[PDB]
Amino acid sequence: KQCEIQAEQISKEKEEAERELEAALPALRRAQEAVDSIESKDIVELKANKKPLDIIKYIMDAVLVFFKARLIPIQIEERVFNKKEGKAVLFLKESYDESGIQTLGDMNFMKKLKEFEKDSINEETIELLEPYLNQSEDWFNDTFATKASKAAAGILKWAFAIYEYHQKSKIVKPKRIQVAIAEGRQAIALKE
Amino acid sequence: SKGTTCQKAIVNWEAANPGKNPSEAEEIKLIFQIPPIEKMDGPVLNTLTKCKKLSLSSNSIDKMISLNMLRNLEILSLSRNVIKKISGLEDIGGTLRQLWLSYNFIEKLDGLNNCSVLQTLYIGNNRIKNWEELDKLKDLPELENVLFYGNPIYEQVKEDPKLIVLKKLPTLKNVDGYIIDDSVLEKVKQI
């Protein structure tokens, strides 16, 4: 009787957590479609742009952080950039001196963006992109991103899509791991 | 010209978050400040005692400092800055599991050996002009996920990056995004 009561409590907890996990698994599917769906369309526009605006460059920097290649760096060669029709000066690390030229030259850029390893914690990248997330509203906003160019909005969405997918994946593993441990204990209890 | 002050930036960041507590947050988002954060101040950072993920990406930081005084840091994100040298990380070496530092100016991996618990290293688009750094990097017994896409050495490689990368380090499980593959291992053996 004690085992049965424990199993029933475990089952109720498992069902609520499973519903949360199921929502997270659709959220992750939507996030994966968001970046995978953009394909090389956004990349072709970025290549076509050639010399993008500072707001567009910031969106590229977020994508560059995931790439982890030749990232610019604690503000060297960084200056305040005017945004839209507002004379506002905001402090930033600034765009990469030569990282973009090397990335643009490679024909595997579509191959790089198109395939991303699943279940990637990216703790080092998220800390690097943590400052960008707080200021995201100012320059990573979809309305602001769309205004500079159609392609820039897609690249920012592509960077944003991957971050959302990573958060969903972490929740799916951890909260899912607690649900899974409860389920395993329940299964052992059920065999008993 | 000292355009960005961490305390100033921190004050804005704290205000934007609107969290009562300066150091309660597990993910501190200091990325993309306008104007950029230049050089981080260790003393100001030290208050971030709960932080597991420090986001300092998309700024203009030139160096690494104030590793000590950090107690829970697991993910250090410094991508798209102006960093040249891996250093001043002893203060977080006991806990740091991921270093995200793509789009910087790192050509030498000297000093990476201190991050004994590192599992993930993202460093796309850095400098890196020799597989010499990888030998130093190997001492990382827990390193499973590595990103080198965009590096100068890869360009001079003149061979598929995914394969050679797998061959270079036995420990890595994922290289430039890709999962370990039986076929990939066979290809590496052939190489």
Numbering used by the authors:
A (entry chain A): 3178 to 3369
B (entry chain Q): 2 to 192
What did the published study say regarding this structure?
Each HC of the axonemal dynein consists of an N‐terminal tail domain followed by the motor domain.
We thus have obtained an apo state, depicting the post‐PS conformation from a nucleotide‐free dataset. The tomographic map suggests that the γ linker is in a Post‐2 conformation, which was observed in neither MTBS1 nor MTBS2. In situ all three linkers appear to be in a Post‐2 conformation. MTBS1 fits worse than the MTBS2 model, which has the β and α homolog linker in a Post‐2 conformation. Step 1 is the translation and rotation of the γ dynein head including the MTBD. The linker of the γ‐HC changes from a Post‐1 conformation to a Post‐2 conformation. In addition, the stalk of the α‐HC adapts to a more straight conformation by a 1 nm distal movement of the MTBD. The resulting MTBS3 structure is shown in Fig 3F–M. Through this remodeling, the cross‐correlation score between the 20 Å filtered MTBS2 and MTBS3 structures and the cryo‐ET map increased from 0.6797 to 0.8402. In the post‐PS conformation, the stalks are upright and extended, maintaining a certain distance between two MTDs.
